[PDB]
C-alpha cells in the first residue's frame, strides 16, 4: 500500500538529453517498484509547476512509459520549496486519487539549488513532516560539491541524510542509483 510521487526539476540548465535520461530513470523506477497497491504521481517544477499525472490518472492507465513519454521541459529558474508544497497539497490530495492510510513517498530530482523562491524550506518542510511525507532527494552534478549545497539536500530529504539523500555526477549516472533507490523504497514499503 504506497503512493509514490516524483517532483522533477525541469529548469533551463538541464540539457534535453539529460531531461530525457531523467524521464528514462523515472520510468524504470515505476516499472521496478510495480506492486498491486502501488500508485505513482508526477509533478515537474522550475519557476512554473505542472502535474503530468495524478495517482487517479495512473490508476486508469498503469503504463509508466505511456505517461512519461509526453512530458515536456518547462525551463526557467528553480523554486524547489514551492514545488514541494504543491506536491504535498496537490498530488497527496484525495481528489487526485491519493489514499488516506497509504505510505506517502516523494522522490525529488534536481540539478541545482533553489533561488528566488517566494517560499522557504521552513514554510514547506514542517507541513510535509506533519502530512507524513517520506522524502528522498537526488542531487545531480557539480551544484552539490560544497558543504552549504549538501545541507540543502539534507533539508529537502527526511532525516537521516544517509537513508534519504542520493548524489550523482550527472544524468547519465542516474542508472547507478537505480538499484539502491528501489531497495530503499522497499525497506519500510
Amino acid at each position, epitope marked *: 500500500d504506497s503512493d509514490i510521487a516524483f517532483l522533477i526539476d525541469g*529548469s533551463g*540548465s538541464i*540539457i534535453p538529453h539529460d531531461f530525457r535520461r531523467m524521464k528514462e530513470f523515472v520510468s524504470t523506477v515505476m516499472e521496478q517498484l510495480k506492486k498491486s497497491k502501488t500508485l505513482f504521481s508526477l509533478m515537474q517544477y522550475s519557476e512554473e509547476f505542472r502535474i503530468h499525472f495524478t495517482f487517479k490518472e495512473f490508476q486508469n492507465n498503469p503504463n509508466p512509459r505511456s505517461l512519461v513519454k509526453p512530458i*515536456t521541459q518547462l525551463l526557467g529558474r528553480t523554486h524547489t520549496a514551492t514545488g514541494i508544497r504543491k506536491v504535498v497539497r496537490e498530488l497527496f490530495n484525495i481528489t487526485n486519487g491519493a489514499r488516506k492510510n497509504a505510505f506517502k513517498i516523494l522522490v525529488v530530482i534536481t540539478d*541545482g*539549488e533553489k533561488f528566488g523562491d517566494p517560499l522557504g524550506y521552513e514554510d514547506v518542510i514542517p507541513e510535509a513532516d506533519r502530512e507524513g511525507v517520506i522524502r528522498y532527494v537526488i542531487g545531480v552534478g557539480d*551544484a552539490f560539491r560544497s558543504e552549504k549545497s549538501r545541507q540543502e539536500l539534507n533539508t529537502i530529504a527526511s532525516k537521516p541524510p544517509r537513508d534519504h539523500v542520493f548524489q550523482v555526477n550527472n544524468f547519465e549516472a542516474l542508472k547507478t542509483i537505480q538499484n539502491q533507490l528501489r531497495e530503499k523504497i522497499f525497506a519500510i514499503e
Partner: antibody
Amino acid sequence: QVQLQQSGAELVKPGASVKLSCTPSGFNIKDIYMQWVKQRPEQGLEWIGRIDPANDKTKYDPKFQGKATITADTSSNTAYLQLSSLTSEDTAVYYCASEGHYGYDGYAMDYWGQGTTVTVSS
Amino acid sequence: DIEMTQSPSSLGVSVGEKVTMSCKSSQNLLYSSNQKNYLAWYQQKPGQSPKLLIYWASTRESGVPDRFTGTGSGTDFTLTISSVKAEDLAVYYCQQYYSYPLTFGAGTKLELKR
C-alpha cells in the same frame, strides 16, 4: 532583421479596455518568455508580467494584479497585453521584451519591441 | 521586491572620457549553483527602446563595443565606458533577473558637459 513588432498607438477613454499586441519576426513565441514593461513619461522601466507561450503560464507584479492580462497566440506567433479599467495612470509607452532560453536557469531581456503609446483621456 | 539603486541619476560626460555608473541591489544576485550574477545592463537612446548591453553582470551582448565593461558581484555592480563616444549618450538601466518581480533601476542619464 530579427525583431519584435508591436501594434500602433492607442487613444482610449477612461474606464475602457485596450489590447496591445507583439509579434516577433525571426523566432517563435513558444521558445521565449514574453515580458511586458511599462515606461511612464520621463520615468523608469516598470515590469508588468510575463508569459510562457508554450503552456500559457503567467507571472505578474502584484501592482498590476487586476489591471494587466498577458496572453499568447502561437497560431499568429503573437503575445498580447490587455489593460482594463483605464485611468490617466495607464498613459505610458508599453514595451514587449523576450527573455530567451539559452541553457541557463533564466536570462536577461535580449530582444525589445519598438514600444506602443497608450494615451488615456476623456 | 528587490530594490535596484542606480547612481548617479544624471552624469556630465565629455567625449573620450572614462565613465562609471553604479547599480546596488537590496538582495544578493549571485546564484551559487552556476556562479553567475543575475544582473543586466540596458542602454536606452532617446526616442528608442531599451537594448541589452551586458548580461551575467560582465558578458557583453553581440555587437556591443569593447568600450562597455561590466563589473561587480553579489550586491554592488558597476558599468564602465572607457573613451565615451557621442553615440553613447543615453539612459543606462540595470535590472535583476534573479527572482520575481523582475526589478529595474531608476537609470543613469548621460548628458554632454559644457
